[PDB]
Amino acid sequence: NSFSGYLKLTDNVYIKNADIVEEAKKVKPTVVVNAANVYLKHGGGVAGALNKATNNAMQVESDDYIATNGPLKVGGSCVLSGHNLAKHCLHVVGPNVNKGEDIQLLKSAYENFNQHEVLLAPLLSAGIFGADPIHSLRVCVDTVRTNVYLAVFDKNLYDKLVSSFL
Numbered sequence: 001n002s003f004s005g006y007l008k009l010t011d012n013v014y015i016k017n018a019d020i021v022e023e024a025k026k027v028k029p030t031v032v033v034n035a036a037n038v039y040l041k042h043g044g045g046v047a048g049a050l051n052k053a054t055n056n057a058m059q060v061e062s063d064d065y066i067a068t069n070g071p072l073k074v075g076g077s078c079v080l081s082g083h084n085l086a087k088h089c090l091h092v093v094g095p096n097v098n099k100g101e102d103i104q105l106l107k108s109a110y111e112n113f114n115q116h117e118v119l120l121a122p123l124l125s126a127g128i129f130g131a132d133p134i135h136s137l138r139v140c141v142d143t144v145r146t147n148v149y150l151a152v153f154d155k156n157l158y159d160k161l162v163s164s165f166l
């Protein structure tokens, strides 16, 4: 958990302008959060990048989990191996509001982070899922009580978040 160059936003929320994959390789955190979908099909975004950095080992393990357990629910999670990136990967499903899923489930999604003392994570429900990323950071700050290190890859978004927050 050797995090460096983060800006502290609250007592338990830190932020850095970085690619979450590069952070995972350097830090080797106990937990890396994936912004997953209910079938754990890691096709793009954070999920595609984390899976690519495991050389598809994350996808093979995710397919076996879905065969035995079935899909996750929106707002839910599962803990699987972190492979070469972390001890564990916490796969979390935020609502896709562009497909009618309720924005109140974004609070349920961030509540999963509270089972882990320290996490490396992206913002949930942003991008193709349609939630406003500044609103997603406000839900994170109001829901997560354990120590979260947020990696924001787009510098333009990182600057908007830091301006809106502090």
Ligand SMILES: COc1ccc([C@H](NC(=O)c2ncnc3[nH]ccc23)[C@H](C)c2nnn[nH]2)cc1
Residues within 6 Å of the ligand: 018, 019, 020, 021, 035, 045, 046, 049, 122, 123, 124, 125, 126, 127, 128, 129, 133, 151, 152, 153, 154, 157
């Ligand atoms: C569907 O769920 C999401 C949830 C996060 C997002 C976007 N995050 C990423 O795609 C991302 N974040 C950190 N490291 C990364 N490495 C490769 C991709 C990547 C949001 C918009 C964003 N942009 N810049 N920082 N965060 C897109 C969709």
